[PDB]
Design a protein around this ligand. Structure first.
Ligand SMILES: O=C(Nc1c[nH]nc1-c1nc2ccc(C[NH+]3CCOCC3)cc2[nH]1)c1ccc(F)cc1
Length: 263
């Protein structure tokens, strides 16, 4: 439907192995968006093309204030193009380096927005699995927007593994190579939540190998300034056993959420 000549490319928004995302304006609509440029070249070499058109599948038929829109795609010779909703306020990652830590009220809010976002997603048996600060964009309202549905997947499944990837946000089951459902995303939400308050993720290490242990044994500790309600909800989120992990609904209802969730 679309083609490159339909756009005016703006400034580079960032990187990634397969290319860059650029700001861009739709020529005859004046519409602002982001263009993720992916080289066919590298997608095949690094055998991921399967993933692409699945990221496209899922993130297309998806509609939620807290999920980055994907308007469509296209390609030419050299590369494939992803027409992404543009999120004015950068990444939560970046806001994190920026602020070093978030407060209870900012954290809570994100969790809420996050919860609901994920809520909608499970409802369609869609599991994200790769929720990390780098993947969280901010809308103008300052609101969370889950990007990147690359690893995203249906059903309760088992993945084609490959170890070479940051474990920091993976749940024990995933990492241990096991039976994993939509409970992963609640483990994620827990990590996310801890990182927001403390400034690093609770399982951080210097090596793939140590983290693996750390995650596998659920070894984490709270700095003093982490409040009780925080500790509670995080503790409740970070159970080795998928089954003991709250339902998203319970997370919304948690008293430390609702005390603090501005939005
Ligand atoms: O695709 C990406 N980002 C986006 C998708 N949609 N919208 C974006 C997006 N990212 C940014 C980053 C910065 C800004 C502008 N803002 C100005 C004020 O200071 C903070 C940055 C906009 C933007 N949109 C993306 C982001 C980060 C990566 F590492 C790889 C890809």
């Amino acid at each position: 439907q679309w083609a490159l000549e339909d756009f005016e490319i703006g400034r580079p928004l960032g990187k990634g192995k397969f290319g860059n995302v650029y700001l861009a304006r739709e020529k005859q609509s004046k519409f602002i968006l982001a263009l993720k440029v992916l080289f066919k070249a590298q997608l095949e070499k690094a055998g991921v093309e399967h993933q692409l058109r699945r990221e496209v599948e899922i993130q297309s038929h998806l509609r939620h204030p807290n999920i980055l829109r994907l308007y469509g795609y296209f390609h030419d010779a050299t590369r494939v193009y992803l027409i992404l909703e543009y999120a004015p306020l950068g990444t939560v990652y970046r806001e994190l380096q920026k602020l070093s830590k978030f407060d209870e009220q900012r954290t809570a809010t994100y969790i809420t927005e996050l919860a609901n976002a994920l809520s909608y997603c499970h409802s369609k048996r869609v599991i994200h699995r790769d929720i990390k600060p780098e993947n969280l964009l901010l809308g103008s309202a300052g609101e969370l927007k889950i990007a990147d549905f690359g690893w995203s997947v249906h059903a309760p499944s088992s993945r084609r593994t490959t170890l070479c990837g940051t474990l920091d946000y993976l749940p024990p089951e995933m990492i241990e190579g096991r039976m994993h459902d939509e409970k992963v995303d609640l483990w994620s939400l827990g990590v996310l939540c801890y990182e927001f308050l403390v400034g690093k993720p609770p399982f951080e290490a210097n090596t793939y190998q140590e983290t693996y242990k750390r995650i596998s044994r659920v070894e984490f500790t709270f700095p003093d300034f982490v409040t009780e309600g925080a500790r509670d909800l995080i503790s409740r989120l970070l159970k080795h056993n998928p089954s003991q992990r709250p339902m998203l609904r319970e997370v919304l209802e948690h008293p430390w959420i609702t005390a603090n969730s501005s939005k």
